[PDB]
């Protein structure tokens, strides 16, 4: 038998406050508008009008 056998009741999930989720979503949306950040994430946007 292995040491400390794994069990299903490990804490798999996380409960992040809704306000923090909304903060993260707003931050990602704002970052999507910065061409430098979009380029830095690996997207080829050299031909997009704006």
Q: Which residues bind RNA (CB under 7 A)?
A: 2-4, 7, 9-11, 14-23, 25
Q: Closest distance between RNA and the C-beta of residue 23, in Å? A: 5
Closer residue to RNA in complex, CB, 44/50: 44
Q: Report the candidate in 13, 41, 12, 11 with the shortest Cα–Cα distance to residue 28.
A: 41
Closer residue to RNA in complex, CB, 3/33: 3
Q: Closest distance between RNA and the C-beta of residue 21, in Å? A: 4
**How many helices, marked H, and strands, marked E, lie in the chain?**
2, 0
């Amino acid at each position: 038998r292995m040491f400390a056998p794994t069990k299903i009741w490990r804490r798999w999930h996380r409960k992040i406050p809704v306000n923090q989720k909304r903060y993260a979503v707003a931050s990602a949306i704002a970052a999507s508008a910065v061409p430098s950040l979009v380029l830095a994430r690996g997207h080829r946007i050299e031909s997009v009008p704006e």
